[PDB]
Structures are given as structure tokens and as C-alpha cells.
Design a protein around this ligand. Structure first.
Ligand SMILES: C[C@]12CCC(=O)C=C1CC[C@@H]1[C@@H]2[C@@H](O)C[C@@]2(C)[C@H]1CC[C@]2(O)C(=O)CO
Lengths: 221, 211
């Protein structure tokens, strides 16, 4: 029923600006106080801004220092947050939230929209098959993998045989390496089925609009 | 600045235990709220006004406190309760840093697999040696790399997954990144896992000169 849907996030250079939107449905949007909350990469949660139902009462968090401006258009059921002079500490997931009564708990939250402040530019990832090779295995099961190196920004999505190998998958959280992201994904299948049955990793990087398939072939020694 | 702190930052318990977590304020305040978060999704209202349960919250949960001290309590804990719980109050800028509740289970040793650098990465001039340690418990595990018989510490990056939603195991990758020329100067590469499931390590290796 109730829905809150954020948008407008993205990459942004230091010193720039960005306007975030939050579209509402399922309730009388003009009767409710609204807020923006942000979650930093360290998972810390910070109350950014608050606006009363009529648009005539406004508050800001301690580090906002005049660079943020919250506003709303009750006619179009939308809440906004204008950001300016953005700094590296402003990188976070930005959430649209709604208030219940006058003790200011937040009874519904949106899906979140991500904001990243840096000089880095969008970069597609390289994708490398991980066959055992000189490290051949010998059990009823074999484990294979894919290495995904050098992309920005997060995230990538990894699947195996188009999601038909779902069980036995571990896709590890990404880490920054030379200020570019890298992760690996592993899959475990019966050893009797490989290489007789093909195994492929499907890498998708929406921000660079790239999609690659790497078949896992046994190495030519 | 009224500030919140939460204790413990991390705890773990088997299903069926009583669980308690504390939220402290630098000065007295009232009407405390608690929010539950699970990986990949938004925070959810769980407890509000210190004691009221949000909709859909089982009566095993209860919130209480006053003054500068508050707490959230779970009777007969169930696996779905695993999450991060954050306190917050109407005069507070920064949410408390949260307690992460994790599921205790039986000890399990890791399935270890080593992967020599791909020929495609080598073509580009990089050399990543990848070692996977999968389906283990507890989370605390130690990985060691040996290159031609001597320990190596530079250029290693380790990454754990969140506790597995189906079996409560952890997995982790340990990756040794080297330049292609530094990779070509050595032959024996070894990834060792030392866990409290056994005093003797699990060991996987290869010689670069093979294949
Ligand atoms: C309840 C309160 C004051 C009374 C009111 O009519 C509405 C609100 C909601 C927004 C709250 C605000 C104050 O408490 C100060 C807060 C927390 C603000 C959100 C950000 C804030 O300005 C701060 O972070 C100050 O440190």
C-alpha cells in the first residue's frame, strides 16, 4: 500500500551539487512530516533533514551547515533534498522516511538512493576465469570461480549459468584496490559434470552498461 | 550534543536463548525507538516510544528503560531475529552504532581451494592468486600465505560474506595480488587455513612451473 521511491542518486565530483527525489503513494502525503536519513559506508546513520507536513517547519543535522535544502510539493506527492558543495564525507545511501506521531519515529522507509562523491570515473570491470590448472582437485566435487577486477562504481551482479546454478555460490563483498573495486565469486559443482557440462559466470555492471560472459575452460598446460 | 552508544557491538547466540542489548545516552531523554536492519534492505521500525511494538513484531521482543539507559530484549531467540538493531531518539543527530546479533552454530572447518593466476590476467600484466575458504564456523579464521617456503604479508586482501542465510556458515576469499614480473620470480605458492576446528592447518598449493 504505502510506497516511498527515491531517485536522483549517482556519482558526483567534490564541490558539485545533486537533487534527490522521493515519490510517494498510498497515503495522504500532505498530512505527514517527512525526513531524509543517510547511511555512510561505515553503516553509520545520520538524520539529515526534517520537514513538517505544510512545508513551513524545517530542521537539519549538525554537519549540514547550510549546504542542504529540504523541500516538498504536496500536489505531486514528492519530497526533495537539494545538495550543494558536496564533500567526500557526504557519500552515503540516502533514505526517504515518514513520521507517525510527535515523538518522531519513522514508520516507513524508502528503498534508498546512493550518492558517491569522488574524482573517480566510471570504469567497466575485467573478468577472469578461475579454473584449477596446476592446482587440480580430486574429490566428488570441484570448485570454480570468477575474478572481477577494476570497476567503479559499485555494484556488480554475478550469476552462474544464468542463475541456474544458484546453490553452492559464494559472491564475496567487493574491496577497493588502487581505488577500483574487485571481488571474486565461487561455485561448487559435482566434479563428474565438469568440463562435460559448461559453467559460465555472468557479470553485469549497470553503471558502465557492460555485460560479459566468461566460460570456465580447463587450462591448456 | 546528546549522544547514543550501544553495547555489545556484536553478539551471537543459539536459537532458544534470552538476548539483551543496551543503548546509553549522554544525558536523560525519553521515548526511545529501535530499528532493525538486514543486509541489502532498508531499516525497519521495530520498537517505538520505548515500549510499543511496531506491526508484525513478535511478542518475544520487548523494549524498556528510562533516563540515560534503555535496552531491547528477546525471549527464546529465533533465526529470523538475526540483524542489526539501532537505537535513535527525537533529539539525536547520529543513530547509535547498533548491535549485530548473529546465529551461533556447530563448529565447521573450511573447504579450501587455490587458483593460480589466469593466463588472461597475465596477458594484462597482473597476477592474482585466489584462495577460497568456504562454509566454516566460527567466523574468526586465520589465513597464511607462503611463497617458496617463506611467509608473505604484503598484497593480501581478505573478504568475508555475511553469515549464510541457510546454514549460518561463513565464507571468505583471500587474494594475493602481485605484478606479473614478481609472480614470475617464484614457484611454490601456498594458502593455509588455521581454525579452531583443528590444531593442524588445511593447506592447498601449486607450482607456477606446472601447466
Ligand atoms: C524533534 C525536532 C524539534 C521539534 C520539532 O518541531 C520537530 C523536530 C523534528 C526534527 C528534529 C528536531 C530537533 O530535535 C533537532 C533535530 C534532531 C531535528 C532533526 C535534525 C536535528 O535538527 C538535529 O540533528 C539537531 O542536533
Amino acid at each position: 500500500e504505502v510506497q516511498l521511491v527515491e531517485s536522483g542518486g549517482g556519482l558526483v565530483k567534490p564541490g558539485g551539487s545533486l537533487k534527490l527525489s522521493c515519490a510517494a503513494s498510498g497515503f495522504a502525503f500532505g498530512n505527514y512530516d517527512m525526513s531524509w536519513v543517510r547511511q555512510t559506508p561505515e553503516k553509520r546513520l545520520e538524520w539529515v533533514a526534517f520537514i513538517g507536513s505544510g512545508g513551513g517547519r524545517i530542521y537539519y543535522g549538525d554537519t549540514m551547515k547550510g549546504r542542504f535544502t529540504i523541500s516538498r510539493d504536496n500536489a505531486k506527492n514528492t519530497l526533495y533534498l537539494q545538495m550543494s558543495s558536496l564533500k567526500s564525507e557526504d557519500t552515503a545511501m540516502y533514505y526517504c522516511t515518514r513520521h507517525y506521531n510527535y515523538y518522531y519515529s519513522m514508520d516507513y522507509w524508502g528503498q534508498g538512493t546512493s550518492v558517491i562523491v569522488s574524482s573517480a570515473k566510471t570504469t567497466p570491470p575485467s573478468v577472469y576465469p578461475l579454473a584449477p590448472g596446476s592446482a587440480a582437485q580430486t574429490n566428488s566435487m570441484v570448485t570454480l570461480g570468477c575474478l572481477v577486477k577494476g570497476y567503479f562504481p559499485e555494484p556488480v551482479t554475478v550469476t552462474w549459468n544464468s542463475g541456474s546454478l544458484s546453490s553452492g555460490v559464494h559472491t564475496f563483498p567487493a574491496v577497493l584496490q588502487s581505488d577500483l573495486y574487485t571481488l571474486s565469486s565461487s561455485v561448487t559443482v559435482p566434479s563428474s559434470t565438469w568440463p562435460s557440462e559448461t559453467v559460465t559466470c555472468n557479470v553485469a555492471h549497470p553503471a558502465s552498461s557492460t555485460k560479459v560472459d566468461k566460460k570456465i575452460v580447463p587450462r591448456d598446460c | 550534543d546528546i549522544e547514543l552508544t550501544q553495547s555489545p557491538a556484536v553478539m551471537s547466540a543459539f536459537p532458544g536463548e534470552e538476548v539483551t542489548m543496551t543503548c546509553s545516552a549522554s544525558s536523560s531523554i525519553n521515548y526511545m525507538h529501535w530499528y532493525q536492519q538486514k543486509p541489502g534492505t532498508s531499516p525497519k521500525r521495530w520498537i517505538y516510544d520505548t515500549s510499543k511494538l511496531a506491526s508484525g513484531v513478535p511478542a518475544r521482543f520487548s523494549g524498556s528503560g528510562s533516563g540515560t539507559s534503555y535496552s531491547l530484549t528477546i525471549s527464546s531467540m529465533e533465526a529470523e531475529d538475526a540483524a542489526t538493531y539501532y537505537c535513535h531518539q527525537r533529539s539525536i543527530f547520529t543513530f547509535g552504532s547498533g548491535t549485530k546479533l548473529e546465529i551461533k552454530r556447530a563448529d565447521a572447518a573450511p573447504t579450501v581451494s587455490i587458483f593460480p593466476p589466469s593466463s588472461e590476467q597475465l596477458t594484462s600484466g597482473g597476477a592474482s592468486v585466489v584462495c577460497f575458504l568456504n562454509n566454516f564456523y566460527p567466523k574468526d579464521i586465520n589465513v597464511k600465505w607462503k611463497i617458496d617456503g617463506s611467509e608473505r604479508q604484503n598484497g593480501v586482501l581478505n573478504s568475508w560474506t555475511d553469515q549464510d542465510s541457510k546454514d549460518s556458515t561463513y565464507s571468505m576469499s583471500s587474494t594475493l595480488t602481485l605484478t606479473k614480473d614478481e609472480y614470475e620470480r617464484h614457484n611454490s605458492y601456498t594458502c593455509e587455513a588455521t581454525h579452531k576446528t583443528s590444531t593442524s592447518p588445511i593447506v592447498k598449493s601449486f607450482n607456477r612451473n606446472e601447466c
